[PDB]
Structure 1
Amino acid sequence: SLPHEKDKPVAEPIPICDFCLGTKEQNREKKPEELISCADCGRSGHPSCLKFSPELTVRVKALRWQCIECKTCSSCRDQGKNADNMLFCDSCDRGFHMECCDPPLTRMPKGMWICQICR
């Protein structure tokens, strides 16, 4: 974890998937699947409804994971006017503004992208 994520309180999780309305007992394939929940708003989703790979799912369960809308840049801690184009790491799902990457990026990377923390 990052220092600013450590001991930063997490919201009460809602035990329903906001995408399919199932619980941990029933995803869209009518099979059990544990939810993941946003640390800031508490809303939840099945990893299969979020379209997360098994490997990404394992990693975000060990991190202070944020949903798409709550996601803040792991460098500058902001969302801001360029929020819609924040990159999401394909290893840890953290967000980074292109201009906050190391090195700063002028154009969107192509294909799978791994952030400066994971690379």
Structure 2
Amino acid sequence: EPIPICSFCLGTKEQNREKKPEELISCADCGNSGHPSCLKFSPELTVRVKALRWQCIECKTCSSCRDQGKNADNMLFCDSCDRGFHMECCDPPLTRMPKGMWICQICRPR
């Protein structure tokens, strides 16, 4: 169950797709880990997520109100901490889908 392996390349933190050593980001609910390169994570997420309770795409929840359901599936993932936030939970309120990288209110105050 706690097997520290990658779901994309079946490799551990000691060996990546190209035998490259790098820590693995294991889901705090499923325990499934994956390399930042395999998960297409950002340099900030790699260091920002390794120090916080990370959740996979099927576990990611809202940090503002902290809820689940249909709206929880349409939330936005932070490009700085990978925290999910409902479209309406974003601070300030989300006007429209931003073409590019999104960052939660916890990472970018108002």
Q: Which TM-score tier does this pair reach, normalised by the shorter chain?
A: 0.7 to 0.9
Deviates more, 1:48-57 or 1:74-83: 74-83
Q: Distance between the aligned counterparts of 1:43 and 1:104, measured in 2?
A: 32
Q: Deviations over 1:82-119 (max 9, x none)?
A: 33321111111100010111232242122112110017
Secondary structure at the aligned position of 1:55 is classed as helix
1:116 to 97, 105, 109: 105
Shift of 1:32: 1.7
Shift of 1:23: 1.2
Q: Distance between the aligned counterparts of 1:60 and 1:25, measured in 2?
A: 18
Give the share of equivalent positions with the same residue, in percent: 98
- Write 1 or 2 for the structure with the bigger share of helix: 1
Secondary structure at the aligned position of 1:57 is classed as helix
Q: Which runs of 4+ in 1 moved over 4 A?
A: none
Secondary structure at the aligned position of 1:83 is classed as helix
Tell whether the 8 Å contact from 1:90 to 1:112 is kept in structure 2 after alignment. yes
Unaligned stretches of 5+ residues in structure 1: 1-11
Unaligned stretches of 5+ residues in structure 2: none
1:100 to 89, 92, 104: 89
Q: Distance between the aligned counterparts of 1:65 and 1:59, measured in 2?
A: 10
Tell whether the 8 Å contact from 1:13 to 1:38 is kept in structure 2 after alignment. no
Tell whether the 8 Å contact from 2:42 to 2:79 is kept in structure 1 after alignment. no
Q: Deviations over 1:49-100 (max 9, x none)?
A: 0011222200111111111110011112123113332111111110001011
Deviates more, 1:27-36 or 1:90-99: 27-36
Say how many residue pairs are matched: 108
